[PDB]
């Protein structure tokens, strides 16, 4: 929450790449596990299918061929190469955490993606121009002022009631 209100971290493309790689990693995690479990070959005779696998078998325990058709027809495209598939699973989340890191190196220096100048020049001149970007900066300003005195006590911030940004009523 510090990082939202002081750095506007959600707006930083390096974090956005990171979000994509973590949520895409989880997607790859789930969709690959679910695909394997639902393209298994029948290699035993019970309803617990976990026993039909010998780690020394030569054979693929599921059907790449049927998996590929399923996903080509459901989603338009599919993996066909098992090696690229598990390499891509490494790449996606590993690449996303790296992008996020770069953005934090930026923030070590307060080198933030905090503003869009073009929005602020319009906003400052046109009191009817409002976007989700300006609404979020107003939140950010709330976080800074309401949380700083106690969050950075060594600063001896004293904010009289009357300076504390607040909307109506609240």
């Amino acid at each position: 929450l510090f990082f939202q209100g002081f750095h506007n971290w959600t707006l930083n493309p390096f974090h956005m790449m990171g979000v994509a790689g973590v949520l895409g990693g989880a997607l790859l995690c789930a969709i690959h596990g679910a695909t394997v479990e639902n393209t298994l070959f029948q290699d035993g005779e019970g309803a617990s299918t976990f026993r039909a696998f010998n780690p020394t078998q030569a054979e693929e325990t599921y059907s790449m061929v049927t998996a590929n058709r399923f996903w080509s027809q459901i989603f338009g495209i599919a993996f066909s190469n098992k090696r690229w598939l598990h390499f891509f699973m490494l790449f996606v989340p590993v690449t996303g955490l790296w992008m996020s890191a770069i953005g934090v190196v930026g923030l070590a220096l307060n080198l933030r993606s905090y503003d869009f100048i073009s929005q602020e020049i319009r906003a400052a001149e046109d009191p009817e121009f409002e976007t989700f970007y300006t609404k979020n900066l107003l939140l950010n300003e709330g976080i800074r002022a309401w949380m700083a005195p106690q969050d950075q006590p060594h600063e001896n911030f004293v904010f009289p009631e009357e300076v504390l940004p607040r909307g109506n009523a609240l």
Partner: peptide, 22 residues
Amino acid sequence: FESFPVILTDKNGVVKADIPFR
């Protein structure tokens, strides 16, 4: 802080003047 309120204190750091919001 990208922005920061205007508070004035005496030599001892008692708040004495500001630009209020409300």
